[PDB]
Amino acid sequence: MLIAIEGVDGAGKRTLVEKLSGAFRAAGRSVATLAFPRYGQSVAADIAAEALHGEHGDLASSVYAMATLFALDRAGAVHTIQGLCRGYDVVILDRYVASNAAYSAARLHENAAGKAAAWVQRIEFARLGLPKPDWQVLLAVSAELAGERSRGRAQRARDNYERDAELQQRTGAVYAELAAQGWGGRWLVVGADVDPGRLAATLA
Amino acid sequence: MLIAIEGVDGAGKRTLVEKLSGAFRAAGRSVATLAFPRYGQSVAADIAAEALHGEHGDLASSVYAMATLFALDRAGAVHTIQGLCRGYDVVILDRYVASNAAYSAARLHENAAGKAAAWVQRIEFARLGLPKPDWQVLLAVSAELAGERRDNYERDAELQQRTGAVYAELAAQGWGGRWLVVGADVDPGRLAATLA
């Protein structure tokens, strides 16, 4: 059971992951989680994160270069993911391939029918052979609320993606299209106040 | 000993690799060779090559993105390079880290003492852990000659010229270590003796 949690920055995905982990365990299922990008576990991921903070010259200016780095981070995680799928009943991922499709498309002002989303699919699933997720869960949230989380959980720093209010808005919209068309597999759209117990009963 | 053969497209690096290898062997030393990018061997390399042929959207438009891909390709070869260095007296690399510094600086119209060349050193040697070469041998060729003897880089003549110019300065400034500049007519025996 591979489950990917998706959503814009500040959507509160960690929380959902935690609450979902609990509900699955209470139901007698073993759970392991993994978050992408794998900061500290991938140079590709670390360089990508630093680039979003203005480092590494013109790296972040290229939409496909950034998508590639995130895709290569996941590629070096293929074994880790498979290992978790064998060691646990449910594997929960905080962000996965659809993050790349949603953000790359939004950065290019494209929708789900654009080249970037199709490119992401070919590269990650068909070429890098990343495991297709059984369920992709979109945590839909208020754009204002999500944006405030970023401004708050920081000024208490936001990278180039987090500061781009319009990018976040378009990402949420592409996410909705992906979910609607079952991009990459079966999706489930949930809200913040979603019930963990039923969510887990629904997914499994 | 780790030796890197550097030069622009059409320098004749493969030929020099064979000659130098032949000379070291005759001198009673075991030699192993490796070439970069490791086309067909790593995703980073293939994506980079493809991007140079117009694939992958705006990937190639980013100098640091292309550089990062070639660096990540070498990063995947670290275990291979270390193995070769443990089993052979001399390891000769056809293109190495300096290639990234030269092409990146050239695309940005920077020089050997620039930011990109410094970035390449910070990233590849320290962060990625690529062994620094004992010698970097530049098979220098003028733009005129190179022009005499097909991706986005290959087709860009001004880029090739500027890359040659940066290589010449990297060598003169001892970027990342000791350099030797040689021509296609260099005597293998003397070269091998100089490097020994």
Ligand SMILES: Cc1cn([C@H]2C[C@H](O)[C@@H](CO)O2)c(=O)[nH]c1=O
């Ligand atoms: C994992 C991942 C994150 N991102 C974005 C979301 C954030 O702004 C940031 C780190 O999670 O990068 C992608 O664009 N693609 C990806 O594949």
Ligand SMILES: Cc1cn([C@H]2C[C@H](O)[C@@H](CO)O2)c(=O)[nH]c1=O
């Ligand atoms: C190995 C390497 C090659 N290149 C260039 C040279 C050619 O145009 C092509 C393949 O060798 O890419 C780099 O820009 N950086 C590198 O690190």
